[PDB]
């Protein structure tokens, strides 16, 4: 249910918007996973 998945084929604009929101959440999660702060 995210725009990242190529197999995902949205049926309507509501599903498209939900996919955009899920993609944004996944991008935030990935950014926090890959974040490496400077401790000095």
């Amino acid at each position: 249910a995210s725009l990242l998945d190529s197999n995902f084929v949205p049926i309507n604009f509501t599903e498209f918007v939900q996919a955009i929101s899920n993609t944004y959440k996944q991008r935030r999660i990935q950014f926090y996973e890959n974040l490496k702060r400077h401790k000095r």
């Binding site: 725009l3 084929v9 949205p10 049926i11 309507n12 604009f13 599903e15 498209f16 918007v17 955009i20 929101s21 993609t23 944004y24 959440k25 991008r27 935030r28 999660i29 950014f31 926090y32 974040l35 702060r37 400077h38 401790k39």
Partner: protein, 313 residues
């Protein structure tokens, strides 16, 4: 859906090229939680207790005893929905505008839908980050003619009931005086039992360049930044103290913990830019599209944020 609407397909293909907001560096992963609301409010209840008088000595017979009072507090967070309209070129008109190495009318400032949407989304994310930091929405550099927003909508800098310090004009370049004010604010902080948590400082570039100077004869292998980190580690139970720089701030230093219990960000799941289904069309080659975004959702405990303002002249 993509077969019927080309704009949705273009948005899906171009959304991956939009950079993540810089506000994420200012919060921990646990501090941010998404809520399912576009416009409206969300409320929570907190219960507190207090002592009314000195304790009563139980000697012989007594009927009048001191009382312990209780109080309730209702906290409200508001969420607002805002929109922008932007012009672009119709999909079945690009072939009459494709140049040798670019697409669009330079003379009339017309762009393809994908590029226009990308630039609009970047600008909207910049405004959203500015709002998350300063607590205001304005397009002027002077911070005037601000958009009147609803109450209970605050940022990390305009949050009330926090510790505020002001370095005087004569001490604008005196890092010792600035550090004295920061120490006063740090002492006035009231982290309490949530002290064992990482801390975050956001500083302007000029004050950061002042910090990177060695601590003052001058102590070798010791900087003002190191002294500040040690001072904050004294109060946060020797936890990590992150320091970030932001051009949005100007002569401002912002210190706050990264504990979800004290400071929480509960933004809407539709806060970031989202295209609208409505697309204005006509007989010409110029169409209009709409982008929606939601603002609001910062909650904090009182007397947990230090804001230092260095009054310039």
């Amino acid at each position: 859906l993509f077969d019927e609407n080309y704009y949705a397909k273009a948005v899906a293909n171009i959304i991956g090229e939009v950079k993540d907001p810089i506000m994420y560096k200012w919060f921990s992963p646990d501090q941010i939680e998404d809520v399912d609301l576009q416009m409206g409010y969300q409320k929570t209840v907190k219960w507190d207790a207090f002592l009314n008088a000195n304790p009563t000595t139980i000697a012989n017979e007594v009927n009048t005893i001191s009382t312990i009072g209780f109080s309730s507090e209702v906290v409200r967070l508001n969420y607002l929905k805002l929109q922008y309209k932007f012009r672009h070129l119709k999909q079945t008109s690009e072939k009459f505008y494709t140049s040798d190495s670019y697409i669009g009318d330079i003379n009339n400032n017309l762009l393809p839908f994908a590029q226009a949407y990308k630039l609009a989304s970047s600008e909207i994310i910049k405004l959203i980050n500015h709002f998350v930091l300063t607590g205001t929405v304005s397009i002027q550099k002077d911070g005037k003619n601000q958009k009147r927003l609803l109450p209970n909508m605050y940022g990390l800098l305009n949050m009330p009931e926090q510790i505020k310090e002001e370095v005087a004009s004569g001490d604008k370049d005196k890092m010792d005086k600035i550090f004295e004010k920061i120490e006063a604010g740090l002492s006035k902080l009231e982290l309490g039992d949530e002290f064992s948590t990482p801390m975050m400082v956001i500083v302007d570039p000029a004050t950061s360049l002042k910090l990177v100077k060695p601590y003052a004869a001058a102590s070798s292998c010791e900087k003002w930044e190191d002294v500040l980190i040690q001072t904050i580690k004294a109060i946060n139970n020797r936890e990590d103290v992150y320091i970030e720089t932001s051009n949005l701030l100007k002569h401002k230093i912002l210190i706050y913990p990264l504990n979800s219990e004290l400071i929480k960000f509960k933004p809407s799941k539709y806060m970031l830019p989202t295209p609208n289904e409505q697309v204005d069309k006509d007989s010409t080659d110029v169409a209009h599209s709409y982008i929606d975004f939601v603002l609001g959702g910062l909650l904090a405990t009182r007397k947990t944020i230090l804001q230092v303002n260095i009054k310039q002249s």
